[PDB]
Amino acid sequence: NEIVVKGARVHNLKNITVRIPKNRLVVITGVSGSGKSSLAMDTIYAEGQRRYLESLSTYKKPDVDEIEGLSPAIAIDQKTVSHNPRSTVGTVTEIYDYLRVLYARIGKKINGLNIHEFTELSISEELEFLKNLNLTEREREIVGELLKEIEKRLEFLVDVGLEYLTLSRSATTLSGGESQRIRLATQIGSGLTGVIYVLDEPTIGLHPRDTERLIKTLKKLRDLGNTVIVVEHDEEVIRNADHIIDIGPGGGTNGGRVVFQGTVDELLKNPDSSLTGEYLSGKRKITVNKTRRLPYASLKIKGVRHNNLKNIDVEIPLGVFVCVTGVSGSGKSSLVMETLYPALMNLLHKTKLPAGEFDSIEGHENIDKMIAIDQSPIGRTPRSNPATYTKVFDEIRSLFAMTPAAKARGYNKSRFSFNLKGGRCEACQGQGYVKIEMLFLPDVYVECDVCKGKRYNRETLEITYKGKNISDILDMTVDEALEFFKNIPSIKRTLQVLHDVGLGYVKLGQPATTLSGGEAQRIKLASELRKRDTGRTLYILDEPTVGLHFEDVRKLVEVLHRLVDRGNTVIVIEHNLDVIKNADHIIDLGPEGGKEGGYIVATGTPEEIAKNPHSYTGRFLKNVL
Ligand SMILES: Nc1ncnc2c1ncn2[C@@H]1O[C@H](COP(=O)(O)OP(=O)(O)O)[C@@H](O)[C@H]1O
Numbered sequence: 001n002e003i004v005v006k007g008a009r010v011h012n013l014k015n016i017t018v019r020i021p022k023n024r025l026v027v028i029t030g031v032s033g034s035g036k037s038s039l040a041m042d043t044i045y046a047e048g049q050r051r052y053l054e055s056l057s058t059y060k061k062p063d064v065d066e067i068e069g070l071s072p073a074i075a076i077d078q079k080t081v082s083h084n085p086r087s088t089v090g091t092v093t094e095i096y097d098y099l100r101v102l103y104a105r106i107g108k109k110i111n112g113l114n115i116h117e118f119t120e121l122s123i124s125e126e127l128e129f130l131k132n133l134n135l136t137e138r139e140r141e142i143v144g145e146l147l148k149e150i151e152k153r154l155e156f157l158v159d160v161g162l163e164y165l166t167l168s169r170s171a172t173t174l175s176g177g178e179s180q181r182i183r184l185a186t187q188i189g190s191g192l193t194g195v196i197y198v199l200d201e202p203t204i205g206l207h208p209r210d211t212e213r214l215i216k217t218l219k220k221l222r223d224l225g226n227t228v229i230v231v232e233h234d235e236e237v238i239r240n241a242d243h244i245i246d247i248g249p250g251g252g253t254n255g256g257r258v259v260f261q262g263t264v265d266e267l268l269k270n271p272d273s274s275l276t277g278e279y280l281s282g283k284r285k286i287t288v289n290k291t292r293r294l295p296y297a298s299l300k301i302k303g304v305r306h307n308n309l310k311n312i313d314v315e316i317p318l319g320v321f322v323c324v325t326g327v328s329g330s331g332k333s334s335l336v337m338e339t340l341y342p343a344l345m346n347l348l349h350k351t352k353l354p355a356g357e358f359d360s361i362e363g364h365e366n367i368d369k370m371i372a373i374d375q376s377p378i379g380r381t382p383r384s385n386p387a388t389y390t391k392v393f394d395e396i397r398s399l400f401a402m403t404p405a406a407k408a409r410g411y412n413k414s415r416f417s418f419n420l421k422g423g424r425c426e427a428c429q430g431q432g433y434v435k436i437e438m439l440f441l442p443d444v445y446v447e448c449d450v451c452k453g454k455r456y457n458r459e460t461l462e463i464t465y466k467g468k469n470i471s472d473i474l475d476m477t478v479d480e481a482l483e484f485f486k487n488i489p490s491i492k493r494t495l496q497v498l499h500d501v502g503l504g505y506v507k508l509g510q511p512a513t514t515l516s517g518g519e520a521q522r523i524k525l526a527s528e529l530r531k532r533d534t535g536r537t538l539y540i541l542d543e544p545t546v547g548l549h550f551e552d553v554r555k556l557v558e559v560l561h562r563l564v565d566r567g568n569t570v571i572v573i574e575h576n577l578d579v580i581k582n583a584d585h586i587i588d589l590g591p592e593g594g595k596e597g598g599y600i601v602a603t604g605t606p607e608e609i610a611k612n613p614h615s616y617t618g619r620f621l622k623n624v625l
């Protein structure tokens, strides 16, 4: 049987009708902004969940005509995460309750450890502890099958690359990738069948060493009797699909269409319609830089012992492209984000950030500035958008104020701000939607019926520049606007860097709160790229390929080489081999995650790492060099 999506029009989807096989591993592919999430999350998941919830007591619809063959749907992404600070790995996985029943059926301690002490072992240690239990002959008969269930659920955590976590770990201290995979392990452990699962890039944060095991886990989720829809860019996940849906042909206005549908073999046989197929067949490639850079100096952080780091000294060559690599849990974010970054902020720029344990830093005088480019949002209210954040909107407002019609009406540039009274729609605060005054719980946000969502009063909307009013400009994608304003240098420059980091599909007025973490990071990256005379700035970026198709990664790599070419240093934490194979220098941590990680397993060029038999990263690098 099949899901039949009829007349899908959410965002840039071109009123498409798509048939999707059920009880299959379906991989949705395509460049950023092509419409993968619009189809899989905003249409299929949303409607499947909505139709189930409408069966409840006492009880929104996406822009779509109908969906045949729908089932209740469950999403696994970075938004389906716990916000309860009380929650731990043990509680969000539902393993803690099983442990409670186990301890109530045996005693306060089991083989020397109480329950809290059990939860403080890593997952692999917990598994070995339980499997080395045969303390009794009849307690077996009261907990036996129960232990099996506990073991089953722990094994699923190992299977999604999280063996280094403890059950006692606070859920809010997990990364987005860790949270996604925790939820995957919990959903497969639940054994629920008959649902449509929609997963957003479940390889985020996962080393290639673990990809195959993740793929087996996705197939087990399928084999329970579920449809498993995965939005993914990873080549191996794509090659393991039962069915591929490739969205394109491009992003933004140039996207919203299914350009290929069928098996992997069919995609390889006829790839010239899809970028995805061209990369998969080798017709298109992210190039390996064949001139590795040498550093002009280095800095060195000594005695790092934060978390599992094994009292390591780490040298950062400056003026080159640096990747920090290694399996998940090996210590990369502990080293880079939680020790080196705050320690250099404190030395160079206004201290007082807490930093992981370490002895000293030498050579920090060899850089002038330390800037993190992370995935935290660019703003917290829809009053922020890409145009205001990069501050090109101030230039667009001046331009509108300079039209003959605006000057004759007395409209200065403030008239064209939706954050100031005057030109903005005062009913909807200059946002386009109003709430219902209940008393406080998440109310409905209905579209403003005065302005119809356009954010400005009708008088302000009468001013046009080349037939477009200010609302029209906010509805342009970056690429549209980049063509529209190509004769205005200050505007074109900002729009150009947004296009160069791969955000040509993003609308100028998209509210900050709807942007993914990767999109926020790339906007901030474009802001840094736009600046002149940065010189000896060290930039740190954590996993900047989240959300990125092959072509998007090609763009990201070009941008990073541009930053380094103008004298900067770049450190990225990555698992992506197309980025790593472009590094001038790699610091590979591990060998494993947790207690058996935290060592420096290898350093040097991609070629040197590839030659190192102790490096998992080098083992996969070998095949792309
Ligand atoms: N919440 C939103 N509001 C308005 N436009 C959006 C929103 N989310 C995505 N878009 C736009 O819709 C188009 C498709 O986006 P999306 O479905 O997220 O692409 P993908 O998942 O393929 O990266 C893009 O031009 C994007 O900028």
Ligand SMILES: Nc1ncnc2c1ncn2[C@@H]1O[C@H](COP(=O)(O)OP(=O)(O)O)[C@@H](O)[C@H]1O
Binding pocket: 164, 165, 166, 169, 173, 307, 308, 326, 327, 328, 329, 330, 331, 332, 333, 334, 335, 593, 594, 595
């Ligand atoms: N609150 C915490 N935040 C981050 N890591 C933690 C925390 N508590 C313990 N750790 C551990 O530190 C070790 C290294 O983790 P991390 O630096 O996150 O690895 P990576 O970034 O390579 O995936 C892991 O064993 C991880 O479980």
Ligand SMILES: [Zn+2]
Binding pocket: 425, 426, 427, 428, 429, 430, 431, 432, 433, 448, 449, 450, 451, 452, 453, 454, 455, 456
């Ligand atoms: Zn309004």
